[PDB]
Amino acid sequence: EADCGLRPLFEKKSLEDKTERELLESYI
Amino acid sequence: IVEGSDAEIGMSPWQVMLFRKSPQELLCGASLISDRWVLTAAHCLLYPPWDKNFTENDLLVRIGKHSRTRYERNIEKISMLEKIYIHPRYNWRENLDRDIALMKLKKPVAFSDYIHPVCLPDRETAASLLQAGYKGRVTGWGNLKETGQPSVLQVVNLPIVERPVCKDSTRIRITDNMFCAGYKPDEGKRGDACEGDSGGPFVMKSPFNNRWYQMGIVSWGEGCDRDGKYGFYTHVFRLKKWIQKVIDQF
Amino acid sequence: GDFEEIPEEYLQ
Ligand SMILES: *[C@@H]1O[C@H](CO)[C@@H](O)[C@H](O)[C@H]1NC(C)=O
Ligand SMILES: NC(=O)c1cccc(Cl)c1
Ligand code: NA
Ligand code: NA
């Protein structure tokens, strides 16, 4: 769907979960 | 999940629990890909060596959950299955090649703060992100160690492993429809899926568009969280033409 | 016995 992969309690509110930064830091 | 942590509320709103009607028990993980379609591992539904061959009426899916065992009134939604579709070249005889299945729900599920679909990768996102060292995230309600069970959904982040290392870790024949993930013995950190996590998602958050994509399905491992072993995941993008064919037709 | 009973509507 058009809105896939965007979580109501996180991305939709611009809140980050406690460990997503670990993923981002690995994408080097 | 071994060596993970409790999920945050709404952290994995695509997570699905495959639930046996009788006896009432956890069978596998799964993921929500639209209001009517759920993705899982074929071996969660069909595995003749263990006399497993479920029909639609044997099963329910529970969506929006956090607690493993409790009925989450006003939060979870429970759906019946209209039809199961197993990949026609799923290899249960040898190595679980093409370990993928779809389940169509009888009625659409209502999205909420707790229930929301994950994206399936396009070729470009898959090519960019399926690289050794890049981490994804695995979630589930499976066992906490190989040899116990969690109160709530568990989460662990794990790096994709170089293909030669995956192959050299096992006697099983590894195919292009699989990838492996986990830390190496010398990397210090650890973590893995375990029994009951099968069928659930390995997801990555695209740094290009800030969406979560399901790159893998928890497929198999030799034990759980053993040094020098890795978890093996169904390569979702490689099988996406089959997924699209099923959804287009049915 | 590990799991809380789900509403009977989902088993019918
Ligand atoms: C699984 O069950 C169906 C019948 O419900 C059967 O027709 C099918 O052949 C079985 N598949 C295997 C591999 O036994
Ligand atoms: N028994 C499993 O489903 C299992 C165990 C470890 C890793 C993986 Cl990917 C799956
Ligand atoms: Na080998
Ligand atoms: Na390991």
Short mmCIF file of C-alpha atoms and ligand atoms in Angstrom, two decimals:
data_model
loop_
_atom_site.label_atom_id
_atom_site.label_comp_id
_atom_site.label_asym_id
_atom_site.label_seq_id
_atom_site.Cartn_x
_atom_site.Cartn_y
_atom_site.Cartn_z
CA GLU A 1 0.00 0.00 0.00
CA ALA A 2 0.79 3.70 -0.50
CA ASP A 3 1.20 4.17 3.25
CA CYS A 4 3.17 1.01 3.91
CA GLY A 5 6.05 0.90 6.34
CA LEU A 6 5.21 4.11 8.23
CA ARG A 7 4.25 3.34 11.83
CA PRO A 8 1.44 5.35 13.47
CA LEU A 9 3.32 5.61 16.79
CA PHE A 10 6.74 6.39 15.26
CA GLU A 11 7.23 7.74 11.74
CA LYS A 12 3.75 9.27 11.54
CA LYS A 13 4.51 11.31 14.69
CA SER A 14 8.21 11.86 13.97
CA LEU A 15 9.18 9.74 16.99
CA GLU A 16 12.08 7.32 16.83
CA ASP A 17 12.17 3.95 18.48
CA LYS A 18 14.97 3.09 20.89
CA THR A 19 17.19 1.11 18.50
CA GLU A 20 16.42 2.15 14.89
CA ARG A 21 19.52 4.34 14.94
CA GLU A 22 21.63 1.16 15.22
CA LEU A 23 20.21 0.10 11.84
CA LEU A 24 20.89 3.50 10.25
CA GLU A 25 24.49 3.54 11.52
CA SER A 26 25.12 0.19 9.80
CA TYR A 27 24.02 1.49 6.38
CA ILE A 28 27.53 2.71 5.45
CA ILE B 1 14.19 -14.41 20.09
CA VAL B 2 17.49 -14.96 21.93
CA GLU B 3 19.28 -11.99 23.46
CA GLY B 4 16.70 -9.46 22.33
CA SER B 5 14.62 -6.97 24.25
CA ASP B 6 10.96 -6.19 24.77
CA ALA B 7 9.38 -4.38 21.85
CA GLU B 8 7.99 -0.89 22.30
CA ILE B 9 4.23 -0.48 21.87
CA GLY B 10 3.47 -0.15 18.16
CA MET B 11 7.09 -0.86 17.18
CA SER B 12 6.22 -3.66 14.76
CA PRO B 13 2.56 -3.02 13.77
CA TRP B 14 2.86 -5.47 10.89
CA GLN B 15 3.69 -8.36 13.21
CA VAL B 16 1.23 -11.24 13.05
CA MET B 17 0.84 -14.31 15.27
CA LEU B 18 -0.16 -17.56 13.58
CA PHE B 19 -2.34 -19.31 16.12
CA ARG B 20 -3.57 -22.87 16.23
CA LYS B 21 -7.27 -23.16 17.09
CA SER B 22 -7.10 -26.45 18.94
CA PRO B 23 -5.11 -26.83 21.00
CA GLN B 24 -4.81 -23.06 21.32
CA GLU B 25 -1.09 -22.31 20.84
CA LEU B 26 1.50 -20.18 19.00
CA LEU B 27 2.52 -21.76 15.70
CA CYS B 28 4.69 -19.12 14.01
CA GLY B 29 5.16 -15.49 13.23
CA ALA B 30 3.91 -13.75 10.13
CA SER B 31 3.55 -10.21 8.74
CA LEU B 32 0.81 -7.94 7.45
CA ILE B 33 1.38 -6.74 3.89
CA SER B 34 -2.09 -5.25 3.18
CA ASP B 35 -5.54 -5.25 4.76
CA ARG B 36 -6.21 -8.74 3.36
CA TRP B 37 -2.83 -10.46 2.96
CA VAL B 38 -0.40 -12.01 5.43
CA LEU B 39 3.08 -13.33 4.59
CA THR B 40 4.74 -16.24 6.42
CA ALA B 41 7.14 -19.16 5.92
CA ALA B 42 5.82 -22.14 4.00
CA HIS B 43 7.21 -24.52 6.65
CA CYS B 44 4.84 -22.96 9.19
CA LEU B 45 1.96 -24.45 7.20
CA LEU B 46 3.47 -27.46 5.39
CA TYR B 47 6.24 -29.68 6.69
CA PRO B 48 5.65 -33.39 5.96
CA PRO B 49 8.67 -34.67 7.94
CA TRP B 50 6.78 -33.51 11.07
CA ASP B 51 3.33 -34.51 9.81
CA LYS B 52 2.42 -30.81 9.44
CA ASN B 53 -0.11 -29.84 6.78
CA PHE B 54 -2.51 -27.22 8.02
CA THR B 55 -5.76 -26.28 6.35
CA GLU B 56 -7.37 -22.82 6.53
CA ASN B 57 -9.82 -23.88 9.23
CA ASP B 58 -7.10 -25.09 11.54
CA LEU B 59 -5.69 -21.61 12.00
CA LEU B 60 -6.25 -18.02 13.03
CA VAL B 61 -4.09 -14.95 12.72
CA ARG B 62 -3.84 -12.46 15.58
CA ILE B 63 -2.83 -8.95 14.54
CA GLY B 64 -1.89 -5.94 16.70
CA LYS B 65 -0.47 -7.99 19.55
CA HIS B 66 2.16 -7.19 22.12
CA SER B 67 1.58 -9.70 24.94
CA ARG B 68 2.30 -13.30 23.92
CA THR B 69 -0.37 -15.07 25.92
CA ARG B 70 -3.06 -12.61 26.91
CA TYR B 71 -6.18 -11.75 24.86
CA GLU B 72 -5.56 -8.03 24.16
CA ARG B 73 -9.09 -6.78 24.27
CA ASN B 74 -9.79 -3.65 22.20
CA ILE B 75 -6.30 -3.80 20.64
CA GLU B 76 -5.64 -7.08 18.82
CA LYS B 77 -7.81 -8.30 15.98
CA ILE B 78 -8.34 -11.95 15.17
CA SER B 79 -8.91 -12.98 11.56
CA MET B 80 -9.96 -16.20 9.86
CA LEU B 81 -8.24 -17.45 6.73
CA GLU B 82 -9.93 -17.59 3.34
CA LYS B 83 -7.05 -19.34 1.55
CA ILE B 84 -3.44 -20.46 1.93
CA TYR B 85 -0.99 -20.23 -0.99
CA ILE B 86 2.33 -22.01 -0.74
CA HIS B 87 5.10 -21.40 -3.23
CA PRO B 88 4.83 -24.23 -5.81
CA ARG B 89 8.58 -24.85 -5.67
CA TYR B 90 8.93 -24.73 -1.87
CA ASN B 91 11.49 -27.45 -1.10
CA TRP B 92 10.45 -29.14 2.13
CA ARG B 93 12.34 -32.27 1.12
CA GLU B 94 15.84 -30.85 1.33
CA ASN B 95 16.72 -27.35 2.51
CA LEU B 96 13.55 -25.22 2.75
CA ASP B 97 14.37 -23.44 -0.52
CA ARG B 98 11.64 -20.89 -1.35
CA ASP B 99 10.24 -20.96 2.20
CA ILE B 100 7.31 -18.58 1.60
CA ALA B 101 3.52 -18.63 1.80
CA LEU B 102 0.67 -16.18 1.65
CA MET B 103 -2.61 -16.22 3.58
CA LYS B 104 -5.65 -14.28 2.39
CA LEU B 105 -7.96 -13.15 5.18
CA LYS B 106 -11.71 -13.68 5.03
CA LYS B 107 -12.36 -9.97 5.74
CA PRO B 108 -10.10 -6.92 5.69
CA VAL B 109 -8.49 -5.97 9.00
CA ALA B 110 -8.93 -2.40 10.25
CA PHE B 111 -5.69 -0.49 10.59
CA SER B 112 -4.95 1.28 13.88
CA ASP B 113 -2.04 2.54 15.97
CA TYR B 114 -1.17 -1.14 16.50
CA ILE B 115 -1.97 -2.60 13.06
CA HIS B 116 -0.30 -1.33 9.89
CA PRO B 117 1.32 -3.04 6.86
CA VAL B 118 5.01 -3.31 6.09
CA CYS B 119 6.40 -2.54 2.61
CA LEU B 120 7.75 -5.20 0.28
CA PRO B 121 11.06 -4.23 -1.36
CA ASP B 122 11.54 -3.01 -4.88
CA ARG B 123 14.66 -4.17 -6.74
CA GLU B 124 16.58 -0.98 -5.96
CA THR B 125 15.93 -0.92 -2.22
CA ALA B 126 16.88 -4.62 -2.07
CA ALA B 127 20.10 -4.08 -4.02
CA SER B 128 21.03 -1.11 -1.83
CA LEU B 129 20.28 -2.62 1.56
CA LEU B 130 21.05 -6.36 1.26
CA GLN B 131 24.72 -5.93 1.95
CA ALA B 132 26.98 -7.67 4.45
CA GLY B 133 27.18 -5.71 7.68
CA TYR B 134 23.92 -3.86 7.15
CA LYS B 135 21.51 -4.62 10.00
CA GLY B 136 17.90 -5.64 9.99
CA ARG B 137 15.44 -6.33 12.73
CA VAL B 138 13.75 -9.58 13.70
CA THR B 139 10.72 -9.80 15.96
CA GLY B 140 8.71 -12.58 17.48
CA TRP B 141 7.27 -14.45 20.44
CA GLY B 142 9.49 -17.52 20.10
CA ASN B 143 11.69 -19.05 22.73
CA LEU B 144 14.27 -17.01 24.60
CA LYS B 145 16.95 -19.76 24.41
CA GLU B 146 17.58 -22.96 22.51
CA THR B 147 17.21 -25.08 25.64
CA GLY B 148 12.11 -19.81 28.39
CA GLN B 149 9.21 -17.94 26.76
CA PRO B 150 8.58 -14.20 26.63
CA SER B 151 5.81 -12.14 28.22
CA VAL B 152 5.77 -9.71 25.27
CA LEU B 153 7.02 -9.41 21.70
CA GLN B 154 10.83 -9.51 21.46
CA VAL B 155 13.08 -7.60 19.07
CA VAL B 156 16.70 -8.00 18.01
CA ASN B 157 18.80 -6.18 15.41
CA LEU B 158 21.25 -8.39 13.47
CA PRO B 159 23.77 -7.82 10.66
CA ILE B 160 23.52 -9.51 7.27
CA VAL B 161 26.46 -11.89 6.77
CA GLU B 162 28.70 -12.40 3.77
CA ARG B 163 27.47 -15.30 1.62
CA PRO B 164 30.70 -17.37 1.86
CA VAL B 165 30.55 -17.15 5.66
CA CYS B 166 26.91 -18.26 5.61
CA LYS B 167 27.79 -21.22 3.41
CA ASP B 168 30.87 -22.19 5.43
CA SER B 169 28.84 -22.29 8.66
CA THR B 170 26.68 -25.26 7.66
CA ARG B 171 26.48 -28.50 5.69
CA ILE B 172 23.11 -27.50 4.27
CA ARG B 173 23.00 -26.32 0.66
CA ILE B 174 22.36 -22.57 0.67
CA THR B 175 20.52 -21.05 -2.30
CA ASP B 176 20.07 -17.60 -3.79
CA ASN B 177 16.59 -17.59 -2.21
CA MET B 178 18.18 -17.38 1.27
CA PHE B 179 20.40 -14.96 3.15
CA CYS B 180 21.86 -15.27 6.64
CA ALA B 181 22.27 -12.86 9.52
CA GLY B 182 23.81 -12.74 12.96
CA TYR B 183 26.98 -11.76 14.75
CA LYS B 184 30.24 -13.65 14.35
CA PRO B 185 31.87 -15.28 17.40
CA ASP B 186 34.52 -12.55 17.59
CA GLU B 187 32.00 -9.70 17.30
CA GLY B 188 30.95 -9.90 20.97
CA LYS B 189 27.23 -9.07 20.53
CA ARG B 190 24.84 -11.91 19.95
CA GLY B 191 21.21 -12.70 19.19
CA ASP B 192 19.05 -14.90 16.98
CA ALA B 193 15.58 -16.08 16.19
CA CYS B 194 14.44 -19.30 17.87
CA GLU B 195 11.57 -21.79 17.92
CA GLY B 196 8.25 -19.98 17.40
CA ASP B 197 9.81 -17.01 15.57
CA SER B 198 9.69 -18.75 12.17
CA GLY B 199 7.57 -17.03 9.60
CA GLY B 200 8.04 -13.60 11.12
CA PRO B 201 9.75 -10.66 9.45
CA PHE B 202 13.32 -9.45 9.00
CA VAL B 203 12.85 -5.73 8.31
CA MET B 204 15.11 -2.82 7.37
CA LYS B 205 14.33 0.91 7.54
CA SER B 206 15.22 2.55 4.24
CA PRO B 207 17.46 5.59 4.79
CA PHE B 208 16.19 6.94 1.44
CA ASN B 209 12.48 7.19 2.22
CA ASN B 210 12.23 6.34 5.94
CA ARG B 211 9.91 3.37 5.36
CA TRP B 212 10.22 -0.12 6.75
CA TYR B 213 10.72 -2.93 4.25
CA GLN B 214 10.48 -6.66 4.82
CA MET B 215 13.63 -8.13 3.32
CA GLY B 216 13.43 -11.59 4.89
CA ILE B 217 11.24 -14.22 6.50
CA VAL B 218 12.59 -16.15 9.51
CA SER B 219 13.21 -19.55 7.91
CA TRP B 220 15.68 -21.86 9.69
CA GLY B 221 18.66 -22.22 11.95
CA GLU B 222 20.74 -24.97 13.54
CA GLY B 223 19.90 -24.46 17.16
CA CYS B 224 19.53 -20.87 18.34
CA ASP B 225 22.24 -18.26 18.93
CA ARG B 226 25.09 -20.79 18.63
CA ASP B 227 28.58 -19.43 18.10
CA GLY B 228 29.55 -19.82 14.45
CA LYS B 229 25.99 -20.49 13.31
CA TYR B 230 23.66 -17.96 11.68
CA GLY B 231 19.95 -17.57 11.11
CA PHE B 232 18.66 -18.14 7.57
CA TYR B 233 15.96 -15.99 6.04
CA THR B 234 13.84 -16.28 2.91
CA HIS B 235 14.95 -13.63 0.37
CA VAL B 236 11.64 -11.83 -0.13
CA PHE B 237 12.65 -9.74 -3.13
CA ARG B 238 13.83 -12.81 -5.02
CA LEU B 239 10.35 -14.33 -4.63
CA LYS B 240 8.36 -11.14 -5.16
CA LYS B 241 7.20 -12.08 -8.68
CA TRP B 242 5.42 -15.08 -7.15
CA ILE B 243 3.90 -12.85 -4.45
CA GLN B 244 2.63 -10.41 -7.05
CA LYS B 245 1.26 -13.21 -9.25
CA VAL B 246 -0.76 -14.60 -6.34
CA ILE B 247 -2.12 -11.22 -5.28
CA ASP B 248 -2.93 -10.22 -8.88
CA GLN B 249 -4.79 -13.48 -9.54
CA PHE B 250 -6.59 -13.98 -6.25
CA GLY C 1 -3.52 -23.52 29.32
CA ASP C 2 -0.67 -21.11 28.65
CA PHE C 3 -2.81 -18.81 26.49
CA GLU C 4 -5.81 -16.79 27.66
CA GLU C 5 -8.99 -18.07 26.02
CA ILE C 6 -10.00 -16.05 22.99
CA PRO C 7 -13.63 -15.06 22.40
CA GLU C 8 -15.74 -17.94 21.13
CA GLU C 9 -16.83 -15.92 18.10
CA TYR C 10 -13.40 -16.58 16.51
CA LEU C 11 -13.69 -20.32 16.94
CA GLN C 12 -17.17 -20.73 15.45
C1 LIG D 1 -1.47 -31.21 2.17
O1 LIG D 1 -2.87 -31.32 2.38
C2 LIG D 1 -3.70 -31.26 1.14
C3 LIG D 1 -5.08 -31.57 1.47
O2 LIG D 1 -5.71 -30.74 2.39
C4 LIG D 1 -3.18 -32.25 0.14
O3 LIG D 1 -3.98 -32.29 -1.04
C5 LIG D 1 -1.80 -31.97 -0.16
O4 LIG D 1 -1.34 -32.86 -1.18
C6 LIG D 1 -0.96 -32.11 1.04
N1 LIG D 1 0.40 -31.75 0.66
C7 LIG D 1 1.52 -32.67 0.98
C8 LIG D 1 2.91 -32.33 0.59
O5 LIG D 1 1.28 -33.70 1.57
N1 LIG D 2 13.91 -22.74 14.69
C1 LIG D 2 13.82 -21.57 13.92
O1 LIG D 2 12.77 -21.26 13.41
C2 LIG D 2 15.03 -20.68 13.76
C3 LIG D 2 16.08 -20.71 14.67
C4 LIG D 2 17.17 -19.86 14.54
C5 LIG D 2 17.28 -18.97 13.46
C6 LIG D 2 16.20 -18.96 12.57
CL1 LIG D 2 16.27 -17.84 11.27
C7 LIG D 2 15.07 -19.78 12.71
NA NA D 3 29.18 -25.47 3.91
NA NA D 4 25.39 -17.42 16.03
#
